[PDB]
Amino acid sequence: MENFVRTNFNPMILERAEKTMKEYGENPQNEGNKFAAISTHMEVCFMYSDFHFIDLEGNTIVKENDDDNAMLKHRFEIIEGQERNIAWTIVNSICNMTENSKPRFLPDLYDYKTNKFIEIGVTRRKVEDYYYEKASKLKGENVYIHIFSFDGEEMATDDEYILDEESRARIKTRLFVLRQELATALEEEFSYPPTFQRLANQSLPPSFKDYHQFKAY
Protein backbone atom coordinates (compact mmCIF):
# COMPACT_ATOMS: atom_id res chain seq x y z
CA MET A 1 0.00 0.00 0.00
CA GLU A 2 1.19 3.52 -0.92
CA ASN A 3 -0.29 5.15 2.23
CA PHE A 4 1.06 2.48 4.64
CA VAL A 5 3.90 4.71 5.94
CA ARG A 6 1.75 7.90 5.72
CA THR A 7 -1.22 7.02 7.99
CA ASN A 8 0.77 5.04 10.61
CA PHE A 9 4.09 6.83 11.24
CA ASN A 10 4.81 10.33 12.61
CA PRO A 11 5.57 13.31 10.26
CA MET A 12 9.36 13.31 10.95
CA ILE A 13 9.89 9.75 9.58
CA LEU A 14 8.02 10.53 6.30
CA GLU A 15 10.58 13.18 5.21
CA ARG A 16 13.39 10.72 6.08
CA ALA A 17 11.58 8.01 4.05
CA GLU A 18 11.41 10.33 0.99
CA LYS A 19 15.20 10.97 0.88
CA THR A 20 17.64 8.42 -0.62
CA MET A 21 15.14 6.25 -2.60
CA LYS A 22 15.37 8.76 -5.48
CA GLU A 23 18.49 7.42 -7.27
CA TYR A 24 17.91 4.30 -9.48
CA GLY A 25 14.48 4.44 -11.13
CA GLU A 26 11.47 3.29 -9.07
CA ASN A 27 9.09 5.60 -7.15
CA PRO A 28 6.32 5.40 -4.44
CA GLN A 29 3.73 4.31 -7.11
CA ASN A 30 5.48 1.19 -8.55
CA GLU A 31 6.55 -1.39 -5.93
CA GLY A 32 5.48 -2.58 -2.47
CA ASN A 33 8.71 -4.55 -1.91
CA LYS A 34 11.37 -2.10 -0.59
CA PHE A 35 9.31 1.12 -0.23
CA ALA A 36 7.91 0.97 3.32
CA ALA A 37 10.61 -1.52 4.47
CA ILE A 38 13.16 1.35 4.48
CA SER A 39 10.85 3.47 6.75
CA THR A 40 10.89 1.06 9.74
CA HIS A 41 14.69 0.73 9.27
CA MET A 42 14.78 4.28 10.78
CA GLU A 43 11.96 3.68 13.33
CA VAL A 44 13.87 0.79 14.96
CA CYS A 45 16.96 3.06 15.24
CA PHE A 46 15.05 5.69 17.29
CA MET A 47 13.72 3.02 19.69
CA TYR A 48 17.29 1.66 20.00
CA SER A 49 18.78 5.13 20.70
CA ASP A 50 16.02 6.78 22.80
CA PHE A 51 15.81 6.20 26.59
CA HIS A 52 19.38 4.73 26.68
CA PHE A 53 22.43 6.75 27.80
CA ILE A 54 25.91 6.44 29.42
CA ASP A 55 27.32 7.68 32.79
CA LEU A 56 30.49 9.70 33.60
CA GLU A 57 32.57 6.59 34.41
CA GLY A 58 31.27 4.24 31.68
CA ASN A 59 28.05 2.45 32.67
CA THR A 60 24.56 2.06 31.12
CA ILE A 61 21.68 4.30 32.31
CA VAL A 62 18.05 3.89 31.10
CA LYS A 63 16.43 7.25 32.02
CA GLU A 64 13.00 8.83 31.27
CA ASN A 65 13.74 12.48 30.21
CA ASP A 66 15.63 11.95 26.90
CA ASP A 67 17.56 15.20 26.31
CA ASP A 68 21.13 14.45 27.60
CA ASN A 69 21.78 17.68 29.62
CA ALA A 70 25.56 17.91 30.28
CA MET A 71 26.40 14.88 32.49
CA LEU A 72 24.90 12.00 30.40
CA LYS A 73 25.45 11.11 26.72
CA HIS A 74 23.68 9.26 23.86
CA ARG A 75 24.35 5.49 23.58
CA PHE A 76 23.68 5.09 19.81
CA GLU A 77 24.17 7.08 16.58
CA ILE A 78 21.87 6.97 13.52
CA ILE A 79 23.90 5.89 10.45
CA GLU A 80 20.87 4.77 8.39
CA GLY A 81 18.93 7.65 6.78
CA GLN A 82 21.92 9.84 5.88
CA GLU A 83 24.01 10.71 2.81
CA ARG A 84 26.65 8.14 1.73
CA ASN A 85 29.57 10.58 2.23
CA ILE A 86 28.25 11.48 5.73
CA ALA A 87 27.53 7.79 6.55
CA TRP A 88 31.21 6.76 6.39
CA THR A 89 32.38 9.94 8.21
CA ILE A 90 30.28 8.68 11.15
CA VAL A 91 31.91 5.22 11.01
CA ASN A 92 35.50 6.44 10.50
CA SER A 93 35.39 9.16 13.20
CA ILE A 94 34.50 6.43 15.72
CA CYS A 95 37.18 3.95 14.55
CA ASN A 96 39.93 6.64 14.74
CA MET A 97 39.65 7.23 18.51
CA THR A 98 39.03 3.52 19.25
CA GLU A 99 41.21 1.09 17.23
CA ASN A 100 38.40 -1.17 15.92
CA SER A 101 37.45 -2.96 12.69
CA LYS A 102 36.32 -0.92 9.66
CA PRO A 103 33.40 -2.81 8.01
CA ARG A 104 33.22 -3.39 4.22
CA PHE A 105 29.49 -2.71 3.70
CA LEU A 106 27.35 -0.05 5.45
CA PRO A 107 26.23 -0.55 9.09
CA ASP A 108 23.09 1.06 10.60
CA LEU A 109 24.01 1.80 14.27
CA TYR A 110 26.91 1.73 16.76
CA ASP A 111 26.82 1.05 20.53
CA TYR A 112 29.17 3.44 22.39
CA LYS A 113 29.55 1.44 25.65
CA THR A 114 30.16 -2.08 24.24
CA ASN A 115 31.77 -0.88 20.94
CA LYS A 116 29.53 -2.89 18.56
CA PHE A 117 28.41 -1.95 15.02
CA ILE A 118 24.80 -3.11 14.38
CA GLU A 119 23.46 -4.19 10.96
CA ILE A 120 19.64 -4.26 11.21
CA GLY A 121 17.78 -6.75 8.97
CA VAL A 122 14.35 -7.88 10.22
CA THR A 123 11.98 -9.72 7.83
CA ARG A 124 9.32 -12.49 7.51
CA ARG A 125 11.94 -15.31 7.63
CA LYS A 126 12.33 -16.96 11.05
CA VAL A 127 15.94 -16.84 12.39
CA GLU A 128 18.50 -19.27 10.87
CA ASP A 129 17.66 -18.36 7.23
CA TYR A 130 18.69 -14.67 7.65
CA TYR A 131 21.29 -14.96 10.48
CA TYR A 132 23.75 -17.20 8.54
CA GLU A 133 23.04 -15.48 5.16
CA LYS A 134 24.72 -12.28 6.48
CA ALA A 135 27.13 -13.92 8.99
CA SER A 136 28.80 -16.20 6.37
CA LYS A 137 29.76 -13.14 4.27
CA LEU A 138 30.47 -10.31 6.76
CA LYS A 139 32.68 -12.70 8.83
CA GLY A 140 36.06 -12.20 10.56
CA GLU A 141 35.06 -8.71 11.73
CA ASN A 142 32.61 -8.62 14.69
CA VAL A 143 29.55 -6.91 13.16
CA TYR A 144 26.80 -7.53 15.75
CA ILE A 145 23.80 -8.60 13.62
CA HIS A 146 20.61 -8.53 15.75
CA ILE A 147 18.12 -10.92 14.07
CA PHE A 148 14.60 -10.37 15.45
CA SER A 149 11.43 -12.14 14.28
CA PHE A 150 8.06 -10.86 13.01
CA ASP A 151 6.17 -12.68 15.83
CA GLY A 152 8.34 -12.83 18.99
CA GLU A 153 11.32 -15.26 19.00
CA GLU A 154 14.86 -13.82 19.01
CA MET A 155 18.37 -15.16 18.16
CA ALA A 156 21.48 -12.94 18.55
CA THR A 157 25.20 -13.83 18.46
CA ASP A 158 25.93 -16.03 21.54
CA ASP A 159 22.61 -14.69 22.98
CA GLU A 160 24.76 -11.66 23.97
CA TYR A 161 21.95 -9.12 24.37
CA ILE A 162 23.56 -5.72 25.04
CA LEU A 163 20.13 -4.03 25.37
CA ASP A 164 18.04 -4.56 28.56
CA GLU A 165 14.82 -6.65 28.56
CA GLU A 166 12.34 -3.76 29.13
CA SER A 167 13.04 -1.89 25.85
CA ARG A 168 13.40 -4.96 23.57
CA ALA A 169 10.01 -6.18 24.90
CA ARG A 170 8.23 -3.11 23.43
CA ILE A 171 10.26 -3.43 20.18
CA LYS A 172 8.65 -6.88 19.63
CA THR A 173 5.13 -5.42 20.15
CA ARG A 174 6.03 -2.57 17.74
CA LEU A 175 6.71 -5.11 14.94
CA PHE A 176 3.85 -7.41 16.11
CA VAL A 177 1.25 -4.72 15.15
CA LEU A 178 2.78 -3.79 11.74
CA ARG A 179 2.92 -7.52 10.77
CA GLN A 180 -0.89 -7.70 11.17
CA GLU A 181 -1.49 -4.87 8.61
CA LEU A 182 0.28 -6.69 5.70
CA ALA A 183 -2.83 -8.80 4.96
CA THR A 184 -5.49 -6.10 5.51
CA ALA A 185 -3.59 -3.45 3.46
CA LEU A 186 19.20 -1.48 -13.18
CA GLU A 187 18.13 0.51 -16.28
CA GLU A 188 18.88 3.71 -18.27
CA GLU A 189 16.52 5.83 -20.40
CA PHE A 190 16.90 8.78 -22.80
CA SER A 191 14.42 9.77 -25.51
CA TYR A 192 13.36 12.87 -27.42
CA PRO A 193 10.36 14.94 -26.34
CA PRO A 194 8.13 15.92 -29.30
CA THR A 195 9.71 19.33 -30.14
CA PHE A 196 13.26 17.96 -30.39
CA GLN A 197 11.91 14.90 -32.25
CA ARG A 198 10.57 17.30 -34.93
CA LEU A 199 13.98 19.02 -35.04
CA ALA A 200 15.57 15.56 -35.32
CA ASN A 201 13.31 14.86 -38.34
CA GLN A 202 14.38 18.13 -40.04
CA SER A 203 18.15 17.58 -39.55
CA LEU A 204 18.52 14.63 -41.97
CA PRO A 205 19.57 14.20 -45.59
CA PRO A 206 16.85 15.39 -48.04
CA SER A 207 15.62 11.93 -49.16
CA PHE A 208 14.76 10.88 -45.57
CA LYS A 209 11.56 12.02 -43.84
CA ASP A 210 11.95 10.67 -40.29
CA TYR A 211 14.66 10.31 -37.61
CA HIS A 212 13.70 6.66 -36.96
CA GLN A 213 13.93 6.02 -40.75
CA PHE A 214 17.44 7.51 -41.17
CA LYS A 215 18.74 5.74 -38.04
CA ALA A 216 17.56 2.44 -39.58
CA TYR A 217 19.29 3.23 -42.90
Binding site: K73, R84, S93, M97
Partner: protein
Protein backbone atom coordinates in the same frame (compact mmCIF):
# COMPACT_ATOMS: atom_id res chain seq x y z
CA UNK B 1 28.91 14.11 -3.48
CA UNK B 2 25.45 14.53 -1.95
CA UNK B 3 21.77 15.19 -2.79
CA UNK B 4 21.38 16.44 0.83
CA UNK B 5 21.49 20.14 1.76
CA UNK B 6 24.64 22.18 2.41
CA UNK B 7 23.39 23.38 5.82
CA UNK B 8 22.08 19.92 6.79
CA UNK B 9 25.41 18.26 5.89
CA UNK B 10 27.27 20.82 8.05
CA UNK B 11 24.83 20.24 10.94
CA UNK B 12 25.29 16.42 10.87
CA UNK B 13 29.07 16.96 11.04
CA UNK B 14 28.77 19.64 13.77
CA UNK B 15 27.06 17.24 16.18
CA UNK B 16 29.21 14.14 15.61
CA UNK B 17 32.54 16.06 15.68
CA UNK B 18 31.59 17.47 19.11
CA UNK B 19 30.65 13.90 20.17
CA UNK B 20 33.99 12.13 19.46
CA UNK B 21 36.05 15.17 20.60
CA UNK B 22 34.43 14.79 24.07
CA UNK B 23 33.54 11.05 24.30
CA UNK B 24 37.21 10.09 23.90
CA UNK B 25 39.23 13.32 23.67
CA UNK B 26 40.17 16.83 24.81
CA UNK B 27 36.84 18.76 24.91
CA UNK B 28 34.78 19.53 28.04
CA UNK B 29 31.27 18.32 28.94
CA UNK B 30 29.76 21.84 29.04
CA UNK B 31 30.97 22.53 25.46
CA UNK B 32 29.10 19.56 23.91
CA UNK B 33 25.80 21.06 25.11
CA UNK B 34 26.92 24.50 23.80
CA UNK B 35 27.52 23.11 20.27
CA UNK B 36 24.28 21.03 20.11
CA UNK B 37 22.21 23.99 21.43
CA UNK B 38 23.50 26.05 18.49
CA UNK B 39 22.80 23.13 16.09
CA UNK B 40 19.26 22.91 17.52
CA UNK B 41 18.96 26.73 17.25
CA UNK B 42 20.08 26.52 13.59
CA UNK B 43 17.70 23.56 13.01
CA UNK B 44 14.86 25.80 14.34
CA UNK B 45 15.70 28.61 11.86
CA UNK B 46 15.26 25.98 9.04
Amino acid sequence: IGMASMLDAMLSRARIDARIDLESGRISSQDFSEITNTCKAIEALK
